[PDB]
Amino acid sequence: MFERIDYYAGDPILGLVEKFAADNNPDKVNLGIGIYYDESGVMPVLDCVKIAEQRIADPISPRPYLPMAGLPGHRKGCQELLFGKDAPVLKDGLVATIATIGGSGALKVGAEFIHEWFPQSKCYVSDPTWGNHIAIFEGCDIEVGKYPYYDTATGGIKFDEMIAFFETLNKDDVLLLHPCCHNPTGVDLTREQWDTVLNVIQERELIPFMDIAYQGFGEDMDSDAYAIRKAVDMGLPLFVSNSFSKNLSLYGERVGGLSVVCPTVDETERVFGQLNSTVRRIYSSPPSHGGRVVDIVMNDAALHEQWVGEVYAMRDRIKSMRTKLKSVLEAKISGRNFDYLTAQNGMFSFTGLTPEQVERLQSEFGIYMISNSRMCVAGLNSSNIDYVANAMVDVLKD
Amino acid sequence: MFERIDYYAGDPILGLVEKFAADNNPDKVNLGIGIYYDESGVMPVLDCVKIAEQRIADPISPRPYLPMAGLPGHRKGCQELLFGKDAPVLKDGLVATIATIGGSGALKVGAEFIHEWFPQSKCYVSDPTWGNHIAIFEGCDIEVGKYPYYDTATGGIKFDEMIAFFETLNKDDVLLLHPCCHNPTGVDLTREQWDTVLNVIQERELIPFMDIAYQGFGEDMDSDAYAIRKAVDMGLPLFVSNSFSKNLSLYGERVGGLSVVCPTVDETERVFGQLNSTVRRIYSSPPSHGGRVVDIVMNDAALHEQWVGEVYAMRDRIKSMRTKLKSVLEAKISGRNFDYLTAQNGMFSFTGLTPEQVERLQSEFGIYMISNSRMCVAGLNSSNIDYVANAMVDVLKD
Ligand SMILES: *Cc1c(COP(=O)(O)O)cnc(C)c1O
Ligand SMILES: *Cc1c(COP(=O)(O)O)cnc(C)c1O
């Protein structure tokens, strides 16, 4: 019956989860999946979340379906975080927002909406990008290409080539953009580069689709949203998918949002209705427990302030690991360049190791990076940094 | 930008949720959405769920992603419920099962898999069916038709016409079948009718896709699964979507499963891998809180026995309302026929009221049924049964 069905090779990120767990090497280190671990290598339960979950458990309450769009406080939490508290765009009623099944589910609903209402639009992703961007959009029968982004020669952005590429595109083509904390490279546009990009997007009448999953891990909540807020101010038809998986340490509860910025209230109503219709035919409505955690944390000013501080602590630990690893590598290999470790932003660094070097880190040392050279900086701590640096020196020796 | 985007009219079931809440009529009755309410008209928290949620809250634990397939105990819980504890098919390793975002998400993953691997297959749904069946499959760019089912003249199944229809179909065409508790009609196939249907399905090499959302509300857990277990015994390529929304009173946490029965272990591996790939590009992985509730309740023999008893109590209350309403209607309109109320099974009855009569129940009495005449029997209780019967008599008077 099913002999026609290909084996699934497994995902380049998620295929490593079982492998790492199974590995017998006592000095193994997980630098693969983009999860925040603390200084002891443990995933935190945030205090703001622990307080919200105690509230949800007291009393244990009936569990009706949420609205197709999710809880109104979850939607508002996403909007204020992305656009700013009491932003003009929100006061004007010009943003259609739904709660989603993580950032992945937001990308899927956005792609389904684009496939239905803009069937002739093609989507372009950065070279390189998180591979699931391509999987989600191709899975909606949308044609997906790449725009030039990471320059392997400079460790910077091929900015002029990227702009020249955008100038070739058609009205209503979609660009999947990373407003901050680029995945996988950690190489981000400057503010001046954003202003330039968004001007080309406006001129060419392209649709910017910003996917934000590590807000607060770059500079700060407001700075990380610069490109979003700039696009709004320019009047662009912006889609924004956001995830709380990493910044609420709530990966498993599947919490995110999708927002579409519209020119008029009537267009907001049309788009919001169609987002609801799209949700209904994918999963009906989103999960109550994660929605309540988001609602409670984002809308209590005390828990929200506590949460921001917890995110900035995670941000600061990652920054400490970047500096520590760079200083160790610079000492172990005299004169060779590791500036990328402190220049890159967010959860990831792009090490430039070849696929063979990444394979050798795995097989010889039990150190797990993604085959594209991406390393999760949060997997580093005082206990493993020397081991990792020594292994990297060994594999770089070629 | 978005003037091209149609207003969404809202769903025929879910469009009534806000309307009912807003309604000022003090005697309003919700017989729309298929939710179980107790004798006081309140949605229960099941005791088995309350115990599982106390466990999840003690201690509040880190929240890593679940596997793409969900928790192994959630998958096993679905399998044992559908196929039977230690069923030969499970011992043989011939069922590929994932946890899903409710029954809706299982239907969506199954439809996405069918669209990808069987792109030339058409799907057929019963006339009538739950409207979201059509929305989910059409939303995957699968062609959807209907097979003859409910006979308005007899209140029975057009069995011969349905069989004659199946005999016209192509190898690998998909039939969306309700193994029990038909939605919206409550009119179910007999065991002898199932054996006949499944023989035609085998002969024509059709793919049966059974969608089960009210297991335990028909006769009992095992009897309600007859058609599933018969299809397995016959060696059919069965897909089964199941929901725990209604039978665990856990609508908002989004818990269900999708299972595909395969002829060999290698085909099970191919199909299971592709179900994982399909999940990854829709929502990545399912929600932790609902998955843990399913895992804890289904795999603790004490909580599982408690749960079965709670479902059978809901089953029995619905059966008491069917008999009470039938006796009241038979007295209020002498000689006219209400046998359908006790002949139909599960959450629903198909009243045969016209769309205009349904509109009048809503506007004059604040009694909410779906426009296709479907009434949710669990919305009835001692406090509203006379009111409802009187209103039905008034609207039937034409
Ligand atoms: C993690 C991530 C997502 C989605 O993650 P979820 O767990 O589904 O929230 C989306 N985009 C990017 C760039 C990510 O890094
Ligand atoms: C309720 C229902 C579903 C799915 O419901 P979820 O809340 O998504 O579990 C699927 N099919 C049928 C026939 C139903 O009645």
Author numbering:
A (entry chain A), B (entry chain A): 1 to 398
What is written in the article reporting this PDB entry?
The psychrophilic aromatic aminotransferase from Psychrobacter sp. B6 is a representative of pyridoxal phosphate (PLP)-dependent enzymes. PsyArAT exhibits an activity typical for ArAT: transamination, which is a transfer of an amine group between aromatic α-amino acids and α-ketoacids. The mechanism of active site adjustment toward substrates of psychrophilic aromatic amino acid aminotransferase (PsyArAT) from Psychrobacter sp. B6 is discussed based on crystal structures of complexes with four hydroxy-analogs of substrates: phenylalanine, tyrosine, tryptophan and aspartic acid. These competitive inhibitors are bound in the active center of PsyArAT but do not undergo transamination reaction, which makes them an outstanding tool for examination of the enzyme catalytic center.
DL-malic acid sodium salt was used for the PsyArAT/DOH complex creation, but only L-malic acid (DOH) was bound in the active center. The ligand creates considerably more hydrogen bonds than aromatic inhibitors; 10 interactions with residues in the active site were present. Oxygen atoms of the α-carboxylic group of malic acid create strong parallel hydrogen bonds with two nitrogen atoms of the guanidine group from Arg374: (2.8 Å and 2.8 Å). Additionally, they are involved in contact with the amide group of Gly34 (2.8 Å) and Asn183 (3.0 Å). Oxygens of the β-carboxylic group of the ligand interacted, via hydrogen bonds, with Arg280* (2.9 Å and 2.9 Å) and Trp130 (2.8 Å). Hydroxyl oxygen of malic acid creates weak hydrogen bonds with Trp130 (3.2 Å) and stronger bonds with Nζ of Lys246 (2.9 Å). Interaction with Arg280* was of special importance; in this situation, the arginine switch was in the “up” position, and the ligand is shoved further from the entrance; hence, the helix H1 is able to close the active site fully. DOH is a ligand of smaller size than aromatic hydroxy-analogs, and due to interactions with Arg280*, it was shoved deeper in the active site; in this situation, Leu14 moved into the center, enabling proper rotation of H1 and full closure conformation. The small acidic inhibitor (DOH) caused different orientation of the Arg280* and forced closed the conformation of the active center. The functional dimer of the PsyArAT/DOH complex was created from two symmetry-related subunits.
